[PDB]
Assembly symmetry: C3
Homo-oligomer: 313 residues x 3
């Protein structure tokens, strides 16, 4: 598969700072090379230089809005640029607020995209429903067209144009959803598979319904926004908001292996990896190793094996 | 949901003493408040004062029969009292022998009840089949009508009247069943889903069949006797008789979420939590945290989220 | 069930030496007795004395070929001897190269056998496809008739006669397969259930299809070659080549419980247990305990319980 790597060392979407190092440790794990070790054509677009914005007081309760707003605007342009070069955008975060720019830049080139959001949270709070003020928990509210009119003019996001309907997104892995967020889910009829549904149906049926839900009518580009805390913290502990009872390592690989097999992966986000939150050096490597594995699976690595079209005997 | 909390700090049903502290640490985890934080109407009936019975020599091989017998008699009355106040009895144990009084007091008010027993063990040994003499492994033999006549007159249990047929109970989580207990299962035709069945069918189908088995004919009150060792010891280690290969945290939450959704939960037991058996302070908090989560799920907490009937936007 | 225990303390199939102690620690865990504690008729044939072969230089890239070749030849005769005494051969390894002699000696007495290979690897590299040269990763290539002609004359294996077709074997647990090995899988049409399939279908359906695939046409003797690294390293860490995302303890017990229930188990291999690779004394006991449990399940131990044909009441 053909890839376009984009490092997004941003953290102002939430309180903890170590997430900016995500691009660094993932590249350090040898992600670029391992992808190349596969049938992959990789082009590194570099780590986005997120210039400082010293003056950025809260918007009501919303924190660092100008910084978060600019980082997504910068990222949106980069993703659109890689999508125009005919490559799958691979955004290494960074907190999940960056999803706003990633899905935005993607839709500029591919407006018919479908989103699969793997996360323990829905990240669909509005500036008015959020109680924490952390924008990494509001990315989805800015992208939904149905929520246009409920999103006040927050400094830094005047460039945003809702680009996805409630029916063009599927959540997988939910287990920590706020009351207002749950109201929006049920109100806009958003398709989701929380841990309850995964436990009931099995990851296989879950993925079956997910892809059929998004590709039933017609084939379209797929955007995978993967928050590493969607997986159980026993696999990805070095993350800002871990929630027990998460997706297993195996389910995480199953999800991505299936998405790969559709041949429609167009955009990918690997977010919330925070090395500084690993209680040990091993928890840090465990998180990075798991994040790399999910990434490789998105581009071809199959657990049953892979072989080149040649006679090996 | 409307609840009636009853602390049952009892341990004489087995050798290890720390189980009496169960009510204490669960309340200390803020269980009462967290329930209230939900759509719950809570009334604390207090911790049952289990007076000492210094003279209580074994009955043949059966240990502390008078103490265990009195504690269940005392508890049976309390549960019946809360069931008459129109509230779901929530008994915080304490060893599982207390189930004898809980299910007894429940049936006095609701004789048509159905029991779901989540445990790694069947706890259906009779005074004559048990090899350990620990009554926390015999509670079910005293309640089954079919076993009336095989239960000798043990000091402390003259007040007992079998109140459930073999067909009114479903076991879930079995993985350590004695030979005589297995004989009784197959002989009385008791419905069970051991870990083998959970592995074969999946927790979803397991719960589907469980509820259909008990509510097929008609809707009736449900009694959930939950032994925390039914879950894998990686989740609830501070318990007297842990057995590897247990139900996962997720399956445990799935079970209870489904029971809640029936709207028929009438009685609930959270047993065998023993803080003093935690090899570390974390194993103790891990056990308590997991016990609280299963409890909250029984009364409404859903992993997909919850919201009040109001317009959040 | 009637058993014939054979200790195979061999390690020259791979670099790490501690695997030779497998028979020792498994017997030390009280395996013989625990089997007897069940409905089992056990006869210990002893630990095969694998005489030294000082002169054994590599064959091209293949390491210790004469040593590995002789150990399998010796083992093949022992297994055939126990199969003629009407007993299920239970080979305690030892690295997995010994499978060559075990399945060989088994087929001498029961040529219509069917093989179930539980392993994280396919172990089907040929002397020409292997990149490591470790024979414990080539056992299957020597047994397949379809691969006859692609297996050069390696010193120590002139006694070998391919005894199984590609269609008489089923793989379960795959997650680390080489490119050439994957080519052979797809080329000979070998039936396999990698971790992806287990995640998709569930262990129940996996076992359903496995047994139907092998016993569909007609009932035949079953050979179970179980590599302990097929299970997740959180359960069996003391093994030379652990791979994360493996079969759970429960799935491992489900697999064997089902095989037992067919009443067709004829040959069993418990391989790759290496005590010296346990980072702690507990990792060593955890591995051994799990290896014993899978073994007991192969001969009757059911998680739902077991009882003698007598009236327990
Ligand atoms: N990725 C990620 N971790 C936590 C969030 C937000 C959760 C919370 N409901 C909030 O509104 O801040 N998003
Ligand atoms: N909750 C609970 N843990 C262990 C038991 C009894 C098990 C054993 N068969 C006995 O008869 O004592 N019950
Ligand atoms: N049991 C077992 N662990 C590792 C292997 C071989 C794996 C590798 N493909 C090789 O060719 O050496 N077999
Ligand atoms: Mn997120
Ligand atoms: Mn999240
Ligand atoms: Mn119990
Ligand atoms: Mn128990
Ligand atoms: Mn192997
Ligand atoms: Mn292996």
């Amino acid at each position: 598969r053909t890839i376009g790597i984009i490092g997004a060392p941003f953290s102002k979407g939430q309180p903890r700072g170590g997430v900016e190092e995500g691009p660094t440790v993932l590249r350090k794990a040898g992600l670029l090379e391992k992808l190349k070790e596969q049938e992959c054509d990789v082009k590194d677009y570099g780590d986005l230089p997120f210039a400082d914005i010293p003056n950025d007081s809260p918007f009501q309760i919303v924190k660092n809005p100008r910084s978060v707003g600019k980082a997504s605007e910068q990222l949106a342009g980069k993703v659109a640029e890689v999508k125009k070069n005919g490559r799958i955008s691979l955004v290494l975060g960074g907190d999940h607020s960056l999803a706003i720019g990633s899905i935005s830049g993607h839709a500029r080139v591919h407006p018919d995209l479908g989103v699969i959001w793997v996360d323990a949270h829905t990240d669909i709070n509005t500036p008015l429903t959020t109680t924490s003020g952390n924008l990494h928990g509001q990315p989805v509210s800015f992208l939904l067209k149905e929520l246009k009119g409920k999103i006040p003019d927050v400094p830094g996001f005047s460039w945003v144009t809702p680009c996805i309907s409630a029916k063009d997104i599927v959540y997988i892995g939910l287990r920590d959803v706020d009351p207002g967020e749950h109201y929006i889910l049920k109100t806009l009829g958003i398709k989701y598979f929380s841990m309850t549904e995964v436990d009931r149906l099995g990851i296989g049926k879950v993925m079956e319904e997910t892809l059929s839900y998004l590709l039933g009518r017609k084939k379209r580009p797929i955007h995978l926004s993967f928050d590493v805390d969607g997986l159980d913290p026993s696999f990805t502990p070095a993350t800002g908001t871990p929630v027990v009872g998460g997706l297993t390592y195996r389910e995480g690989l199953y999800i991505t292996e299936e998405i790969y097999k559709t041949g429609l992966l167009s955009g990918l986000d690997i977010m919330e990896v925070n090395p500084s939150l690993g209680k040990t050096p091993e928890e840090v490597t465990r998180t990075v190793n798991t994040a790399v594995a999910i990434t490789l699976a998105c581009f071809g690595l199959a657990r049953e094996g892979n072989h080149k079209p040649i006679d090996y005997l």
